[model samples]
Target: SLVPELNEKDDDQVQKALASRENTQLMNRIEITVRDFKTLAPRRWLNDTIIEFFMKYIEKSTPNTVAFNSFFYTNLSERGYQGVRRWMKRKKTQIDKLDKIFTPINLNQSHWALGIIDLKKKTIGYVDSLSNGPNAMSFAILTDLQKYVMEESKHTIGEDFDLIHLDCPQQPNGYDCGIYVCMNTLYGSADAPLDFDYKDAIRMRRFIAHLILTDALK
Candidate 1:
C-alpha cells in the first residue's frame, strides 16, 4: 500500500488547524503542542510525543506487532525494566507471543536509529540511518534483551537469536533521521523494506502532522 500524502490544499488546512492551537490538548493523554508539533516543520528535531504518536499508530496496525517509543531503549539499557512482570502485563502480552517488536533508539540524543527483536526469526537487529554499523552498544542491546527475556518469561533461548544490522533507508541529511526511523518501523512492521526516498522526508512530517491534527495519527 502507498503512504498517505497531503496535497497542497490538505497541507494548508492541516497547517492552519495546528497553527490555531499552540499548546492545547490535541489528544487525550499525550499533548503535542507547538513545542512538539512544530518539529514537523522543516529542519526540526522530532520530540518524544511525535515519535510516540507513530508508535501508537504502528501498534494499531497489527495484533502481534508492537512499537515501543524512542525512550524504550534508554529505559531498558539504563534501568532494565526493573518493574518486571509489569512490563509484560502492562502491554497485555508476553515476549514469546509477539512476532515482531520495533524500538527506535536515540544515540547520545544526536542521531536516531532503530532496533527490532524478531522472535519469529530468532534475531535481534539494530539499524542506524547514519550507518554506524553496529557498535558495542548495539551488541549489548541484543544481549540485554536476551537477559530480559530470561528474567521475565524464563525463556533462556537468548543465545539462539542472532544480532543483525537490519537494512533501512539511509538519511541524506541530518534532520531526516527521525523520519527515517519512523518510516523504517512503519515498513518493518509489515515485514517490508525501507524503500522510501529522501523526497518523502518532508512529506512524511506533514503526513504525520496531518494524522495528528485530524486524529488520524498526525
Candidate 2:
C-alpha cells in the first residue's frame, strides 16, 4: 500500500513543502512517499518486528490470572520465535537480547497488550481489558480467551502474574476503552479506544500475513 511514485505536480508540491519547513527539512509528498518506501519496498519490517517483540515476551513470561490471560503462549508459537529474537538483534545493534526484553513500558503510547513487565520493580502486570468495556466479550468469548491464555502460558498465578484492573477513562457509546492493555516499548501506547479500532488492530494480522504471504520483507 505504500507507494514511491506520485504525479509530477504532486511531487513538486511535496518538494516545496520539504524545503520550507523549520529546522529539519519538511518531507514533501515525494520525500514522504520515499520514507514510507522503507516499509513498502523493504529494507526491513520495522513496524512488525517491534509488534512481535512485544507480543513474544508477553507470551513466554507473563502468567495466567484474572488480569492477564495466556494469549501469548496459547496463540504465539515459541518455535522459531527465534525469528523475533533475530529481528531485534538486527534492529538494536547495540544491545543483547536480555536488555531488549527488560525495557520499561511507556505510558503515553497506544497498545492492545494484555500484560507487561515493570522493569523498575522487576514485576509483571496481567490485565484482562476485554472483560471491562462496553462491548465486553460475550461470556463465551471471554471464557474462551481466558482459557486460551491459561492453556498457553506456563507461568503460575502469583509468580510472573500481577493482575491489573484500574478504572478506565470514558469511551464513545458502544465503545469501551477498557478492552485493551496499556502500551509500552515499541509503539509505546495507551489510548486503547483509538489503537484498537478496526484499522489499527489490522497492524497485527497484516504483519503476520506479510511473513506468510511474502516470505520476508524486501
Candidate 3:
C-alpha cells in the first residue's frame, strides 16, 4: 500500500543523484520511502537489523547506559550460570558505571521481551508488550543477574532489590512487540513510563527509518 512518493524521472536522474554527494542525501530518503512500505500493516514482523540499529544507537548516544547486543541475552538463555557470571566479570567496569542496562530478551526464537536493570533504583524490571503475565524463567534470570551484580560491584543488590514485571504500556498486536521493547527502553532510560500506543506505530516506523537514514530523529 506504500506508493512511491518521489517520482523518478529517468535512470540518468538517479545516476546524477548518486554522482553528486549533495543530492545523495535527498536520494536516500527517496529510496527508503520507495522501498520501506509506509502503509505496511502493523502485523508485519520486525527483523534484527532494525532492533540492533536502535540498540547500538542508544548504547552510543546515552550516557552511563549500556544496551546489550541481542546475542547477550539470547546466549544467557543458552550459556547457563557460570558462563553469564564470566560475561559479567569481563564487563565489570561498564557494569560498575552503568546506571541502566537495556536488554531485549528473545524467547524460544519466537517472541521478544525487554529486561531493564536499574542500578540506582535497585530494581530489575521486565516489560512485555503482549502482557503474557508473570514469567518464572524471566524472574530467575533477573535474580541471577542480581547475584552477578552483588559479586562484581562494590554495591550490593540485596533481597530488597526487587525483581518486578512492570505494568508497562502494552502493544495492540503481535508484530509490534519489538517496537514496544524499543519504546520501553527509551522511556525507561529517561525514568519515564511507557506512554505511547498503537496509533504511533506508523510514526515510530518512519522515525526509526529516518534515524537510520539521517541521524536526525530524536
Candidate 4:
C-alpha cells in the first residue's frame, strides 16, 4: 500500500502541531528546581552531575530545559490517555535508575527507595528528608539503590545509618494519582501545583544540611 501523504513540509507542520498539543507540550523539557540546596560543598557538583547526566542521554533530543515561569501544557489534553500513561511509566523508571546512581542508602522500609547521604556527617536521609509528598515509596526502588551502592562503594557504609521518612501531601490534594516517584519532590497531575514553592525545598535542604554540616544527626 502506497503511503499517500503530504509533502515533507506538510508532514513537518503536522508534527509540529501534534507536538504542541497540551499533553505533548514541552514533553522533552524537564525543569527541576532544587530549593535550599545552595551550598559550597557538593551542591555545585551535584547540580552539575545532574545536568551532565541528563545531557548524556536526553540532550540528543531535549532542549529548552532551563527553568522558566508561566509554563503552559500544550500536549496535555492531546497526548491521549494511554500515551500519557506510558510516558509517566517511563519517567518513573528513569527516576528509579537515577536515584540508584546518585543516592544509594538502604533502610529496611516497605516503601520509598530515595535516600540522601551526608558525606561529611555520614547520615542517610530517606524519603523523610523531603518535607513534602508521600511517605511511602516502592521497596523495589530502594533495593536497586542498595545494589548500586554495594557495587561501587569500597567500604560497607549505609548499613548503620538512621532511617527517616517524612509526610507527603495526601492523595486528594497532592500528587496521588499516577505512580509518580521522585528522588526529592514528587510531581503528578493530581497534586502538583501550577508553580513551584521555595519554602518546602528550602526546608528540605536545611534539614539535610543541618545533619551533614553539624552534629544534628547525632
Q: Worst 10-residue stretch by lDDT in candidate 1? A: 81-90
Our tally of clashes for model 3 stands at 0
Alpha-carbon shift of residue 208 in model 4 (angstroms): 23
Cα lDDT tens digits for candidate 3, 1-218: 11112234433343343344342133231133322332122466665545666676676667888777566776565664445555544544557577988878776665778888888888888788876688776776677656656654645554567888888777766678777777777777777767766666545654455455444333
- Cα error, candidate 3, residue 150 (Å): 3.3
TM-score of each: 0.89, 0.28, 0.72, 0.28
**Cα error, candidate 3, residue 196 (Å):** 1.4
Error of 2 at 154 (Å): 18
Report lDDT (CA) for all predictions. Answer: 0.76, 0.30, 0.62, 0.29
Candidate with better TM-score, 1 vs 2: 1
Model 1 CA deviation exceeding 4 Å by range: 18-21, 81-85
Tens-digit lDDT string for candidate 4 (79-135): 423223333233334321222222322223212223433333344344432235433
User: What TM value does model 3 have?
Assistant: 0.72
lDDT for position 56 in model 1: 85
* Residue lDDT tens for model 1, 80-195: 85733465666778777888888887778877888887888888888777887767877887677666656665755556778787777788778888888888887778888777
Which residue runs of candidate 2 sit more than 4 Å off their true CA positions?
Answer: 1-113, 133-163, 166-196, 216-218
Residue 161 error, candidate 1, Å:
0.6
